[PDB]
Amino acid sequence: GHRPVLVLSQNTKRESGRKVQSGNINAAKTIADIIRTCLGPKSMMKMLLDPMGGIVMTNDGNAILREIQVQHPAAKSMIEISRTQDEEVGDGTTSVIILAGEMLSVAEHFLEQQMHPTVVISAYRKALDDMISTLKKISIPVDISDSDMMLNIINSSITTKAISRWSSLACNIALDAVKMVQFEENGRKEIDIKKYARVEKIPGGIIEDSCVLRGVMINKDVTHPRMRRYIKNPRIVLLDSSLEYKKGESQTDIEITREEDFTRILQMEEEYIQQLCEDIIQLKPDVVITEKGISDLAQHYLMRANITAIRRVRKTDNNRIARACGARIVSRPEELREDDVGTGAGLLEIKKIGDEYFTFITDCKDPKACTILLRGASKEILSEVERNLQDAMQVCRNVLLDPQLVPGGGASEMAVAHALTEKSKAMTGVEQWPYRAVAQALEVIPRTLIQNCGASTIRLLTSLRAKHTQENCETWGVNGETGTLVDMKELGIWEPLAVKLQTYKTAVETAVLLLRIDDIVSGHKK
Amino acid sequence: AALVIDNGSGMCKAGFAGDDAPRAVFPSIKDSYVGDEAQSKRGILTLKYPIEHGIVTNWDDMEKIWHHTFYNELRVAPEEHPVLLTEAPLNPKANREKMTQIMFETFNTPAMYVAIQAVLSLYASGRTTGIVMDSGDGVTHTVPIYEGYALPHAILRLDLAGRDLTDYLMKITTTAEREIVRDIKEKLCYVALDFEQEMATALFQPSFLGMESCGIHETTFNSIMKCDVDIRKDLYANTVLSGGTTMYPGIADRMQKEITALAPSTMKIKIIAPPERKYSVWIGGSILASLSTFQQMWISKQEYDESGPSIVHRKCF
Amino acid sequence: AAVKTLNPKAEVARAQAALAVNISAARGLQDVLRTNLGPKGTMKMLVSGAGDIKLTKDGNVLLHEMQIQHPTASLIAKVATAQDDITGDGTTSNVLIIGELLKQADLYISEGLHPRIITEGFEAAKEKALQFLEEVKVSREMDRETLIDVARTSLRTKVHAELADVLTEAVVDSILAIKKQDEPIDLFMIEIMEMKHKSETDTSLIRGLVLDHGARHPDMKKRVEDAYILTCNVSLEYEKTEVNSGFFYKSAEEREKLVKAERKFIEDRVKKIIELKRKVCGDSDKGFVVINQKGIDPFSLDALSKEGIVALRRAKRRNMERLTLACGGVALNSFDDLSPDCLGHAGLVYEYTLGEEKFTFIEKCNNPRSVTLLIKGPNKHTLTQIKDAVRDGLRAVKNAIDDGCVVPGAGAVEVAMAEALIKHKPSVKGRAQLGVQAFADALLIIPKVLAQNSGFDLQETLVKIQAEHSESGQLVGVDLNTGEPMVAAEVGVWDNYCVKKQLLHSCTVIATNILLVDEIMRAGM
Amino acid sequence: EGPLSVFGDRSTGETIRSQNVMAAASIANIVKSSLGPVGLDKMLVDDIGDVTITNDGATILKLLEVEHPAAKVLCELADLQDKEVGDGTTSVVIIAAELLKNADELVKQKIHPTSVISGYRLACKEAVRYINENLIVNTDELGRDCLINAAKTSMSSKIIGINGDFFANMVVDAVLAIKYTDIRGQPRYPVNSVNILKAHGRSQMESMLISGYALNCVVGSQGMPKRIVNAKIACLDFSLQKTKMKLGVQVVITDPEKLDQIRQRESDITKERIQKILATGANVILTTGGIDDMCLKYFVEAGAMAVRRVLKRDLKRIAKASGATILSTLANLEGEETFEAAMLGQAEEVVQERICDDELILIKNTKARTSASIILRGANDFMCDEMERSLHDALCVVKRVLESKSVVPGGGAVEAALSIYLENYATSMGSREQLAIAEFARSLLVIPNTLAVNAAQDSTDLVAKLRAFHNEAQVNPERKNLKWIGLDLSNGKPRDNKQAGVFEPTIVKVKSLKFATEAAITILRIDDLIKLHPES
Ligand SMILES: Nc1ncnc2c1ncn2[C@@H]1O[C@H](COP(=O)(O)OP(=O)(O)O)[C@@H](O)[C@H]1O
Ligand SMILES: Nc1ncnc2c1ncn2[C@@H]1O[C@H](COP(=O)(O)OP(=O)(O)O)[C@@H](O)[C@H]1O
Ligand SMILES: Nc1ncnc2c1ncn2[C@@H]1O[C@H](COP(=O)(O)OP(=O)(O)O)[C@@H](O)[C@H]1O
Ligand SMILES: [Mg+2]
Ligand SMILES: [Mg+2]
Ligand SMILES: [Mg+2]
Structure with a gap:
């Protein structure tokens, strides 16, 4: 017997040192290599198979990385930064992955050469600040x-x-x-x-x-086929409340001893529905849209007023109908006012697309x-x-x-890399080497563009790095369709400064995150 | 895939077909980040659970729950996945029409199906024929099932559940102390083959509690005797028990003995009641939603649009 | 590879292998569906896991019933499902053209050509083909003869020839009745009822309605001659109170009074119906038929039968509109203020028992804007097959009416578009001309398979047809009885312009997207 | 076993002492690599793929799954340091483990554990006294830059290190914002009232200090406005929903003509309450409870901003900061129900702000007090959590610097000086307690040793130079300015850390020593172990 007298739980595996560093960097650059070919105009589609039998045919970096599953925490972090880029700017989700992978790749060099990760990190932060300066310097307004x-x-x-x-x-x-x-x-x-x-x-x-x-469109039909399906100036009312007779929140238990009381109670229900529908008709609408049910008696009363109703719409669709037709959702027809009625819709139609009935509230003004x-x-x-x-x-x-705009085709990457290399000559400490390596790491975007175009990386990158040493050439980049250097002022590929700023920041900060990491631990329960 | 929402007068126990465990046990299941990822759930956390005694009281509540068991605890869309809901045996038609209107009209589900909780319990045990004794917190039900469907004519309903069971034990009043009696009910409460030899060293009989209708074994026997004489063998020999109520005393053999007594001396009765997976109804629903006969049984969205409450009621009035 | 180092249980097909996978699956689908094409095609039998039998020649049905687990097949099945949802016909041809585009693209990609250039040629050829299609389309006043030829071209592919000649008149008459001048045709106004007792050639068009249920009170009449129809959505059974009222009494007499009173609410609505009946037909000359979307309890059934009313309950939510358009009344959710103007008229109403079920016929309406197709047949699979066929035919006639243009059939438009693409090729810059050639050889799969299915040599027939079209210019296609070229517009072989356009668009799009796939990946675990 | 017959295992003597020391050493080696500006972070994977990156020793030892009691003791030690100080959670563990190591070495030499414990206690007392008398600097002499330097020292070794140049400003500002004075006029800096929200997206440099408050909540209805300028704020601790009668109240109708009116009150009651609130001028209504759609419509029509399911602590802070009164009920001392405008709070703006596809509420420029929120912005949730932990450490450090106005130098200066002084002081105390005090002194050196080791530098040479400097300071009264010398780990050279700006709150080192000493004493008293088999 003599049960194991351990200090940490069995299954707790602890790695440490340059193996952990190299493992994290390799996982990151693997995540990068997954979507490396999905960058540029000459990219190819990827067909991913969901666990739910679905299929996703895409070129989107975040779609791809979100559909694949990993177990390495570095790959987890890279997928998370792709998600971050997608949520923040909604583009560059694969440029960021490639940049982060290349930054980690070039940091592997300095780490193998006895440099400390904090030194590399300080250099990366300097380089990021100077990238920000250079981007804001070369940008133009619109x-x-x-x-x-x-x-x-x-x-x-x-x-x-x-x-x-x-x-x-x-x-x-x-x-x-x-x-x-x-x-x-x-x-x-x-x-x-x-x-x-x-x-x-x-x-x-x-x-x-x-x-x-x-306007807006929903998948809906009239509640009753006597209702109109085409209205050319609809006054629209939106409701969060049920036009049915529902119970009370308290124990509203009734006790009947007289004969007329049952019938009187059921007629009271009918009268309640009548009173709701009259409170609505008093505003004289043409269409009524509810997020909750509409009783058939309420349908009768509305139709008598020549009103068309749509029964159970979603709160999101109700909010869009509000914004489109200019209405205000209410929850008590007694509290209904002309300001809450929806004028602004130019046409309500309910038409058959295929075998389904779709409700359009289109032709709106200022929707x-x-x-x-x-x-x-x-x-x-x-x-x-x-x-x-x-x-x-x-x-x-x-x-x-x-x-603010910045040039595309990798022109921005080369311009900023050149500016960083030029600023590095004043640096006299030991961080100049990682700093210049980050400058050479920005070059990967045009490299990937050229590779996916099917051209010669060496020759084109050489001519381009040389072009960006001249004075007014910070706009020069490459075509992703022919493999030649052009002026972006002549091609027209201009990205938003915000997009590329967020891209660079996410890349550099992900690199910093994975560089600080060491000593992985595992096993312990939640 | 197919979402399998198991209401089961418990929690929502929702998920997907193929999963061996639900992924959305909402009732009694982050912060400091940015967004509405706790407040929206903080609202539901204190909302009363609509189903009482196996019957839906507040429908707006149930709908809000389902909506929060689709967009928040599953992060999916019902407009593309068929839904398998569960209902208690002998559930009023009106509740069926209401939930079918909710799913097809509100959640716009392409197709859905409502299954009886006892039938799915039997499915999770691997069988398709047998009589299920489901005794939970509020109701007791005997559901004869043949070819996998709950025969709608031999469903005998008596009422001796956890409440009614702990009642006499309380007799032998305050919430905390009747819950001490109920804690003993929750713990060991071994069923007695014979109360004589069980009290010597110290539901089956209505007089014991104070009722005057029938025992649960009489109930099973008559539910089997209101079916086909040929399937009688299968009903008698595939009696499957379910429900934490019936589990707590672990009643198998007392039933078995007195059911054998009631039945002719031909059919051999065997009761399989050891599972306690604590998700039997969910797994039965998952099995059904995984099958292709579920696609066969689909009440489709087009079917709903064309028929309404009639399609939910499957005609045959 | 890259993905397998992070998720070891990952499946991955890269570049050429991925292409190999996709095209192979497409060709597999083509091999299955090649035989579905045309009237000389063969019917496949499909047996579910339960044992149910399907006899079908329909591409969409065949796809969903084949037993397949391939991602490319899933993509193509979804494309066909959209084709069917929007047009009703064109699914088999859709699959064939997709498969042939992929094959003809493999012809050039195996030679080291990049798929991007083939897809550029696909886009150019799509443009030119759509242009040639709009040019050759025949704008025709949709007369009964034209619509009959259209419906024949569809039903002869889907069913036997005599049954197709029956369903033709049935479908064309059905649509030409529910049709309103310059107002899109609502096919919901054609109910489709199937009866399983007689021969399949008894399938008919009832200029009225057929409900799949009848009266549940036996003393109710089984035949009504001059009928007032009351279409209602009002519960005539006992409804309990929302607020859980409960009854309290101290005596058996009070219990009796409360039992008599608790039904007063529904007795009043029954009384309203009965008073309307008496006021509108004071004698027994006419009849009165209540059709309720909701229930009717035995007491109400007795009360209405005693007065001579035929009450059917729990009808379909669509039958409300179908009855108000066929008969001509008003559908009611309450009897608050009901008038004889709320009633419809049916020159005959009767009941038909079939085994254990009952049907109710409502015929001899005046000018019903809703009708029904009664699908009679001896077998469940015969009924299913005829339902699919009439769906196709209804969609065909509807599309020919909506799109007042109509395109010649028998692969004629495909042949001519292939010739036009081959004459257009030089105007394309670069090697995308090869993609254009592929597009042409893809378009040519329709006549080829038709020949293949009529039992003729694909190459000989196709050269004959292209030669005839180049010498004359007459849009010609395959004569499935001689293998010779024939003028489709002259012999009455018509296709839907909408269907051909949808084919071109969707097939080009999905084929382009597949050709540009370079990695198939399952890594979600 | 054998004679005893106890149903368990028994370790006794040098065996169990060696085991305890091995356990403590294991725990210390887990965290040694995360000490100082050159320390590195750790990943922790939770057997399900849940990942946690961190440098915080308390966090690391909390996430671990420890079985040995002598290691659970050090985990609890790190937890206690995190509760009482907020920094030093790694140094305290390392020091406790080293004290255990050297003390077990002494016990192997057959010095009685009582004598080792006496010597450790004496050395702790005298080290505390020597710090308090010779190694403290008053922040008054230094001004405000002392707080910034202490914040930067605490933030060094974290993922907000190099950016400390700016983060410290925020941290300092935040504590100065939440400053409040109590009875006795003593200034209190109740951190944990600074709100810290996380939002991946923009870089760290874009993290935001909000003078006011930030709520991880949003408006209840999309028809409500999302910005209000002269914000009159009503903080309510009750829900605004359709009124439900309580448990002991039943509605029993015997005249149907009353049912309607009863149902109507179920909603009109709530309406009246809301009207009263809106009658005072309240444009913003935060509630810990819920708000039905019926009520949200009243707020929409009034042009107000309603927020539901707010957290009680967030509500308390918004109330304290804006001048509002948390009401659990609209009920006064006159037996009626009203809402006075004096119960309202005020704020110069309330906005619903967008942050990377996720909205929050910003209450800006509150009167009656200043409050503080910090929105941390990084590349993903892992980084943001590490930033939150680092910032909590920095805030706690600044708070300690402001409560007690004394700081000590960093870079192993305190440990080197104490090593010198205690190795000289042991000569007076007994003969065996002398050895114990000398070993306490030597143990203290594990901090500069570890700092240098992590910097990948010659620990021996550097710590020897340190001890030489500090001995020169303690034997030459003209050179006491050498006390302020400690390690420079970016160059591997001693340095005047008082002039370099490496400051730590005195309480940090003092509590580290006291807690480490008690933990070592607790573990060093065990000479037997009975591990019973589990009851099952
Ligand atoms: N016609 C083009 N020629 C060269 N580069 C281009 C062209 N169009 C876009 N790009 C560049 O491609 C990159 C965008 O890659 P994309 O595939 O959209 O991935 P991401 O999600 O990173 O934007 C940008 O650097 C942009 O400048
Ligand atoms: N009598 C006929 N002679 C020659 N070709 C025909 C005849 N009837 C139909 N076709 C052609 O056969 C092809 C396939 O018919 P069908 O199978 O209905 O289309 P799908 O393949 O879309 O289901 C159509 O392109 C049509 O033009
Ligand atoms: N910039 C610095 N230069 C020299 N020493 C430092 C510096 N920052 C921190 N230290 C030293 O490192 C030790 C531990 O710091 P740290 O690891 O950040 O806190 P903790 O020990 O609470 O985790 C402190 O005792 C301090 O003396
Ligand atoms: Mg983009
Ligand atoms: Mg066809
Ligand atoms: Mg610290």
Whole structure:
């Protein structure tokens, strides 16, 4: 017997030292190599298989890394930073992974050479600050009133995605959607393209007929077929309350001894429904939309008033209908006011798409919410189109908030790397080497672009690194479609400064995080 | 996949088909981050559980729960996954129409199916035929099942559950002290083959408690005798017990003996009641949702749109 | 590899291997579905795990019933499902064109060409093919003869020839009745009822309605000649109070009074119905039929039968609209203020018992904007097959009406579009011309398989047809009885412009996306 | 076993002492690599893929799964240091383990454990006295930069190290914001009232100090405004929902004509309460309870911002900071129900702010007191959690510096000086207690030794130079300015740490010594061990 007299629990495995460092860095650069080929306009799709029998055909770095599963904590951290980039800016989710992988890769060198991780980290932080300075120095502003300039900004963001074939179409959609979702109340500007720009994918049809509606769309039909399905100036009312007769919250137990009491009580229920419906009709609406049920007697009373009702809508759809038609959701028809009625909708239609009935509240004027109706070949194609449109809309939003632009095609990476190399000559300590290595690590973005284009990395990178030593060449980069150096002022690939700033910050900070890490431990229970 | 929401007059015990354990036991299941990832759940945490005694009292509550057992504790969308809900035996038609209106209209589920909790309990034990004695906290039910479906005509319903059981024990009043009696009910309470030889060293009989209807063994026997004489062998020999109530005393052999006594001296009765997986109904639902006959049984969204409460009631009135 | 170092239990197909996987699966689907194409195709039998039998020639049904676990097959099945949901026809041809695009692209990718260039050629060829399609489309006033030819072209592919000649008249008449001038056709207004007693050629169009249930009171009439129909959604059974009222009495007499009183609420609605009946037909000349979406308890059934009313309960939520459009009344959720104008008229109402179930026919309506197709047949699988066929035919006629244009059939448009693509190829810059060639050879799979299915040599027939189309220019296709070219527009072989456009678009899109797949990966564990 | 017949195992004598020392040493070797500006972080994987990166010794020893009691003791020691001080959780563990090691060496030499314990106690007392008398610096002589230097010293070895140049400012500002004076006019700095939120996204440099409060909550309805300027704030500790009668109250109708009115009150009651609140001018209503949709509509129509399920502690802080009164009920001393405008608080702005696809509430420029929140911004949740822990350490350090105005130098200065002084002082105390005190002194050197080891430098040479400097300081009265010398781990050279800015609160070292000494004494008293087999 003599049970094991341990200090730590069995299954507690502890690694330490340069093995842990090299393992973390290799896991990170593996996560990078997974999506290395998914960068640029000449990328190829990846078909991932979900655990739920689903399929995801994509080029999106965050989609890919989110669909794969890992057990190494470094790979976990890289997937987490990809998620961070996607949530913050909604683009660059694979540029960040590649940059972080390359930074860790170049730090492996200095770590094998007896340098301490904190030295590498201090150098990385210097290099990040100077990247920020250089980006803010080379950026240019944008007149967001120039719809064509904005369409070019959005094209420079979707050119690397599948919808590139209908790029102009998708560009307009994203721009339109964002311009409608811009909302200000009490001095607070808000572009909330997650609650008020909705993407509805209806398989079939053709993608070229997909459109952004001046209103919203839901999958609903009239509650009663005597109700109109087409109304050309609908006054709309929104409710959070059930138009049924529900019980009270207390123990409302009744006690009947007289004969007339049962009938009187049931007629009392009918009268309650009548009184609700009259409190509603007094505002003279044409359409009534509820988040909860609508009793059939209430349907009768509303129809008598020539009102069309839709029974059980979601709270999110109700909020979008509010923003689109200009209404205010209420929960007590007794508290209903003309200011709560929805004027602004230009047409309510309920039409048959395939074998389903869809409710449009379109033709609105000044709708602060929208529905992007996507049509296409299949749920997978349309899910990919939706992700690409998310990229486009998030880019448009980042632009409207921070209108500053930086050059693409890797031009920005080379310009900033050159600036860092030039500043490194004043450095006399030992950190100049990691600092210059981070400068050489920014070069990976054009390298990956050239590799995915199918060109010669050595030659092109040499000519480009040389071009960026001249004076007015901080805009020069590479084409992801032909493998040649161009001026971005001549190509047109311009990303939002906010996107690339967040990219660089996330990359450098992820590198710092994984460098500080040592001494992995495992096993212990939650 | 197929979401399998097992209400089971317990907790939500929701998840996916293929999982051996639910992933969304909401009732009685982060912070300092940024967003609404605790407040939205903090609201539900103190919301009363709608199902009482195996019957839904407040539907708005139940709907809010389901909605929070889809978007928060599963982070999925019901618009693409079929749902398998569970209902208590002899559940009113109105409740069925209500939940089917909720799922198809509110959650816009492509297809759904409502299964009896005893049938899914039998499924989790691996069998498709037998008579299930489900005794929980508020109700007792005998469900004869043949070919995997609860015969809707031989469901005998008597009422002697955990409450009614601990009652006489209390007799032998304050919440805490009747819960001491109930703690003894929760702990060992070995069933007596014969109360004579069990009290010597110190539900089956209504007179004991004070009722005047029938014992649970009489109930099983008559539920078996209101079925086919050929399937009688299977009902008698595949009696499966379920419910923490019936588990606490661990009643197998007293039942077996007096059921053998009641039955003709032909069929050999064997009762399988050792599982206690504490998710039997969920696993039965998962098995069903995994099968393809579940796709066969789907009440589809188109079917719902075309028929309404009639499709939920499966016609045949 | 990269993924397998992080998730060891990961499955990965890279670049060429990934292409190999996808194209192989596509070709597998083609091999199964090649035989479905055309009227000379063969019907497949599909047996579920329960033992249920399906006889089908439909591409979508065949896909969902085949026993397949492939990701590419899943993608293509979903594309076909969308094709079916939106157009009703074109699924087999969809799968065939997808498979052939992938094969013709493998022809050039095996030679080291990059799939990007093939996809560029695919896009160019899609544009030119859509243009040629809009040019060759036949804008025609949709007369009964044109619609009959269309429905024939669909039903002859889906069912036997005599049964197709029956379903043709049934479907065209059905749509031409529920159709309103310049107002999209709501196919929901065509109920589809199946009866399992007679021959399959007895499938008919009832210019009225057929409910799958009847009256549950025996003393109720089984036949009504001049009928007033009351379409209601009002409970006529006992409804308990929402607030848990409960009855309290001190005497058996009071118990009796409360028992008589607790039904007064529903007795009043029954009385309202009975008074309407008496006021609208003061004699026994006419009839009165209540059709309730909700229940009717035995007491109400007795009360209505005694007055000579035929009450059916728990009808379908769609039958409310179908009855108000066929008969011509108003559907009610309350009898508060009901008038004879709320009633519809049916020149005949009767009941038909079939084994253990009952059906109720409502016919001789005046001008019903809703009708029903009674699918009669001796077998469950015959009924299912005829249902699928009539779905296809209804969608075909609806699409020919909506899209007033109609395209010639028998692969004629495919042949002509192939020739046009081959004449257009030089205008394409670079090696994407090869993708264009592939597109053409992909378009050419429709006539080829038709020949393959009629029992002819694909190469000889296709050269004959292309030669005839180049010498004349007449849009010609395959004659499945001689293997010779024939003018499809002259012999009445019509296809749907919407279907061909949807084919081109969706097939091109999915094929492009598959060709650009370079890594298949299962790493979710 | 054998004669005893106890149903368990028994270790006795040098065996169990060696085991205890091995356990303590194991725990100390777990954390030794995370000490000083050159220490490195640790990953911890929780058998399910839940990952935790950290440098905090208390955190590390909390996450571990320890079975040995002599190691559980050191884990509890780190926990206690984290509760009472907030910094020193690693140094205390290392020092306790080294005291155990040397004391067991002495016990092997057959010095009685009582004598070792007496010597350790004496050496602890005299080290505390020597620190308090010779090694303290008053922060008054240094001004505000002393707080910044103490914060930077605490933040060194953390993931906010090099950025300390800026983080310390925030930390200092935050404590100065939450300063409040109590009876006796003594200034109290109740950290844990600074709110710390985490939000991955923008770099660390974009972390935010909010003069006011930040709530991990949002408005209850999308129709409500999301910014209010002259914020009148009502903090309520009750829920605003449809009124339900309590348990001992039943509604029993015997005249149906009353049922309607009863149902109506179930909602009108709540309406009246809300109207009273809105009648005072309240534009912002935070409640610990819930708010039905019916009520949210009243707030929407009034142009107010309602927030539900707020946390009690967040509510207490917003109330204290804005001037509001937490009400559990609208009930006064006059038997009626009203809400006075004096129960309101005020704030110059309340906004719903977007932070990386996740919204929060910002209450800015509260009057009647200043409050402080900090939004940490990193690359992912792991980094953000490590930043929160590092910032908590820094805040606790600044609080200690402000409560007791004494600091000591860092870089092993205190340990070197104590080693010198105690190796000289042992000569007076007994003959065996002398050995115990000398060993206490030598044990104290494990801190600079470990710092140098982690820096990847010559520990022996560096610590010898340190001891030489400190001996020169203690034998030459003209050179006492050498006391302030400690390690410079970026160059491997001693350095005047009082002029370099490496300061630590006196309480840190004092409590480290006291707790380590008691832990070592506790473990050093065990000479037997009876490990019983489990009851089952
Ligand atoms: N036509 C083009 N030629 C060269 N580079 C391009 C082109 N279009 C986009 N890029 C560059 O590709 C990168 C975007 O890669 P993408 O595949 O969208 O991944 P991410 O999610 O990182 O944006 C940016 O650096 C952008 O400048
Ligand atoms: N009588 C006919 N002679 C020659 N070709 C025909 C005839 N009827 C139909 N076709 C052609 O056969 C093809 C396949 O028919 P069908 O199987 O209904 O389409 P799908 O393959 O989409 O189901 C169609 O392209 C149609 O033009
Ligand atoms: N910048 C610095 N230079 C020299 N020594 C330092 C510095 N910062 C911290 N130290 C020393 O490192 C020891 C431990 O610091 P740290 O590991 O950050 O705290 P803890 O021991 O609580 O984890 C302290 O005793 C201090 O003397
Ligand atoms: Mg992009
Ligand atoms: Mg067809
Ligand atoms: Mg510290």
